[PDB]
């Protein structure tokens, strides 16, 4: 009975850790991609506008 | 007593598994916020770097 309980506890703990990692990793990538995309777009718009103004 | 404790251990394993599952979600939410903030901070530096390159 104790061995079966340990097996059930190990499976639940591993699944909980796996679920925790997936949610945390996805949030970091989503936030970084959203933040990085805005960085490139902001510079691209300014560069195009500045080139016409300087000319 | 061991037989009685075995039933208690089986119940303890279920209780510990639920506690770990709640802790995993709590750890994931805390980790995701820090991971997103750290990635945003690096991308914010890149945004200034992209703006500096554009200027």
Helices and strands counted in chain B (H then E):
1, 0
Contact A46 B39 (CB under 8 A): no
What is the spatial distance between Cα B32 and Cα B45, in angstroms, rounded to a whole number?
A: 20
CB-CB contact of A17 with B23 (8 Å)? no
Q: Which of A33, A54, A12 is nearest to B36 (CA)?
A: A33
Q: What is the resolution of this structure in A?
A: 2.9
**Reduced to 3 states, what is the DSSP secondary structure of residue A7?**
helix
What is the spatial distance between Cα A4 and Cα B40, in angstroms, rounded to a whole number?
A: 45
CA atoms within 13 A on the CB side of B1: 0
Q: Which of A14, A19, A27, A22 is nearest to B34 (CA)?
A: A27
- Per the entry, the structure determination technique was cryo-EM
Name every chain B residue with its beta carbon within 8 A of the beta carbon of A4.
10
Q: Chain A interface residues facing chain B, Cβ-Cβ under 8 Å?
A: 1-2, 4-6, 8-9, 12-13, 15-17, 19-21, 23-25, 27-28, 30-32, 35-36, 38-40, 42-44, 46-47, 50
């Amino acid at each position: 009975e104790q061995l079966a309980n340990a097996r059930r506890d190990y499976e639940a703990e591993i699944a909980r850790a796996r679920q925790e990692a997936a949610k945390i990793v996805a949030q970091a990538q989503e936030r970084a991609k959203q933040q990085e995309a805005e960085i490139i777009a902001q510079a691209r718009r300014e560069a195009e506008r500045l080139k016409e103004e300087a000319r």
